[PDB]
Design a protein around this nucleic acid. Structure first.
Ligand SMILES: Cc1cc2nc3c(=O)[nH]c(=O)nc-3n(C[C@H](O)[C@H](O)[C@H](O)COP(=O)(O)OP(=O)(O)OC[C@H]3O[C@@H](n4cnc5c(N)ncnc54)[C@H](O)[C@@H]3O)c2cc1C
Ligand SMILES: O=c1nc2n(C[C@H](O)[C@H](O)[C@H](O)CO)c3cc(O)ccc3cc-2c(=O)[nH]1
Ligand SMILES: [Mg+2]
Length: 474
DNA sequence: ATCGGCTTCGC
DNA sequence: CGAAGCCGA
């Protein structure tokens, strides 16, 4: 007799959704809900491309709920107060949602659940964004993994859950019920501008559930077979481009796994099978970092290891500015930074290259780079972004190798014809690939393009010195 | 507990 | 071919 509310946050789809399917099993009067949260939307680390993608996903989710039989309610404000209020005025029997791993989200959920319980309303929180929940993957000693290799061995051996059913034949709220909650609702989904953002840089995959599923299918039917080694070349469209869809849950993780598994089963070569397996390992890397953040929330605050907590970063603002403005004088680095600010996305090889460059060559606190990435990435995700940056600065629980990438080596290896470089640095197409890769461009040929802001070999030595020196004095 | 193994590499 | 010490079975 009472409606059940499903609260969407980062699972913007109707298909293969654990919490949603569970709620549907309890009632056909399943009403979706999304709460535009100022604490998230107005954070210093928000990207316009990310909000644009989100907004697009919400537009489709509203449509999907309408076709299913009910609707997606939209609220704006603090969910701790709005969600319980909505559930009460609606006399909802329960509120379902999928758990997250981020500190803010988990804290928020604790408050909402508590408020609901006090109101006598059931709050059900299920795991959905991961193939295996955090407490499901532990070492022999029953503790979380800090090393990927072992985590993967465990993770890959675990039986894989299959996609759940999409809810259908829903029952909408009555006109009276809508009247009772009207005061708490937004009449319409605000435009991107109304949310305080502007974006026309495009996306790696169009927003929404439909486009995410389409990309998954297309990727698994062709390109996935060549993932290894095509994944290493930024000039090639060798990766899935699904990152924002996985971040916001426009696609279910079980459906993604199923599609990759299917391609593997129908593969006719060891090369193809290897490529597909490598892509599956990337999905495991995603879970590794999410699990890590869940088990060790302090990771979000910075270096876990005492050594890196004391590292004497040079922090020359002029160098950071040059990095953010793609004016480093290092073509491969500048091209990557241009792709990021202009399109809200960066190939993984380049994310490693520019992160290494910022921390090792410019010797700037990686946390500055972490923030800048969150300010531009359409797929900006605390767990994965913090994981990537700490990896680049090698700041884990124990001493790890100094991963000092050589920009020229990287470019020669992964962009041998400077195709990617020329694509994002069109002003340098007249320069020979050889010089774009080495970074040695004659003054008259750079036509305004900056000379290298630092010397790699020299900076490499200066960084190692700082390191060893501290490793000694500590 | 000994010991294989440690995403992404430079030289 | 040493990675930085040490996780994980
Ligand atoms: C410094 C740095 C910052 C990063 N920031 C983010 C971020 O904010 N959000 C994010 O999702 N990824 C981040 N990455 C990881 C990786 O670069 C991106 O997931 C990838 O570029 C997404 O593109 P894709 O969809 O084509 O990838 P694919 O190669 O198609 O991989 C499929 C999916 O696997 C996951 N995945 C792949 N590689 C990784 C990885 N290394 N870590 C975690 N998940 C991975 C993603 O969800 C991705 O969509 C970062 C990496 C580094 C080195
Ligand atoms: O519930 C919400 N979740 C939003 N999310 C999803 C969240 O990450 C989610 O609430 C997490 O659980 C927070 O820890 C966003 C994610 C982004 O990357 C960018 C913007 C948003 C905005 C919201 C929002 O307004 N409301
Ligand atoms: Mg230790």
């Amino acid at each position: 007799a009472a409606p059940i509310l499903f609260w969407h946050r980062r699972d913007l789809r109707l298909s293969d959704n654990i919490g949603l399917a569970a709620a549907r099993a309890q009632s056909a009067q399943l009403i979706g809900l999304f709460c535009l949260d100022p604490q998230i939307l107005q954070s210093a680390d928000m990207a316009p491309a990310r909000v644009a993608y989100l907004q697009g996903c919400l537009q489709e989710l509203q449509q999907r709920y309408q076709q299913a039989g009910s609707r997606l309610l939209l609220l704006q404000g603090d969910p701790q107060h709005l969600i319980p209020q909505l559930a009460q005025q609606l006399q909802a029997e329960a509120v379902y949602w999928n758990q997250d791993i981020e500190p803010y989200g988990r804290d928020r959920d604790g408050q909402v659940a508590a408020a609901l319980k006090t109101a006598g309303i059931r709050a059900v929180q299920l795991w959905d964004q991961l193939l295996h929940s955090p407490d499901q993957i532990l070492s022999g000693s029953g503790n979380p993994y800090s090393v990927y290799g072992p985590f993967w061995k465990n993770w890959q051996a675990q039986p894989k859950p299959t996609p759940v059913a999409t809810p259908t034949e829903l029952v909408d709220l009555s006109p009276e019920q809508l009247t009772a909650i009207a005061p708490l609702l937004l009449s319409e989904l605000p435009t991107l501008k109304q949310l305080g953002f502007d974006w026309d840089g495009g996306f790696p995959v169009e927003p929404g559930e439909t486009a995410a599923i389409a990309r998954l299918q297309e990727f698994c039917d062709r390109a996935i077979a060549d993932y290894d080694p095509q994944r290493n070349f930024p000039a090639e469209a060798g990766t899935s481009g699904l990152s924002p869809a996985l971040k916001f849950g426009a696609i279910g993780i079980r459906q993604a796994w199923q599609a990759a598994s299917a391609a593997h089963a129908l593969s006719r070569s060891d090369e193809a099978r290897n490529s597909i397996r490598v892509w599956q390992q990337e999905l495991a890397w995603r879970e590794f970092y999410q699990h890590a953040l869940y088990h060790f929330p302090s990771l979000a605050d910075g270096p876990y290891r005492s050594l890196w907590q004391q590292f004497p970063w040079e922090n020359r603002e002029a160098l950071f500015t040059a990095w953010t403005q793609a004016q480093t004088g290092y073509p491969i680095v500048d091209a990557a930074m241009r792709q990021l600010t202009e399109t809200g996305w960066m190939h993984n090889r380049c994310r490693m290259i520019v992160a290494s460059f910022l921390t090792k060559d410019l010797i700037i606190d990686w946390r500055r780079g972490e923030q800048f990435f969150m300010q531009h990435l359409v797929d900006g995700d605390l767990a994965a972004n913090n994981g990537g940056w700490q990896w680049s600065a090698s700041s884990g629980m124990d001493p790890k190798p100094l991963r000092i990438f050589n920009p020229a080596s990287q470019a020669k290896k992964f962009d041998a014809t400077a195709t990617y470089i020329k694509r994002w640095l069109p002003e340098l197409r007249h320069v020979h690939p050889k010089d774009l890769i080495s970074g040695e461009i004659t003054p008259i040929e750079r036509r305004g393009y900056p000379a290298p802001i630092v010397n790699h070999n020299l900076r490499q030595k200066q960084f190692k010195a700082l390191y060893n020196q501290l490793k000694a004095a500590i």
